[PDB]
Write an enzyme that holds these catalytic residues in place. Sequence first.
Site: not given
Length: 87
Positions: A65, A72
């Site tokens: 990530v 987000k």
Amino acid sequence: MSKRKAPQETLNGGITDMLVELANFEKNVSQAIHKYNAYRKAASVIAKYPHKIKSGAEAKKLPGVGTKIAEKIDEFLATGKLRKLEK
């Protein structure tokens, strides 16, 4: 549904909850999608993570990530920077 007594607005993090939500779309992002894998890996390292992260740099150290879904993550904790009553 309704296990014992969950909070009304969660505690703070709730990262793996909204990440797994996009994976649960079952419509725009069901299975064999191009971006559907992005939430599968980001949610695999987030849910394992203790969750909750004020600084956005946290999602950066999380492997898998830190490119598009990292924004987000802060989105969840973006409207949760309220104060804690000083004195």
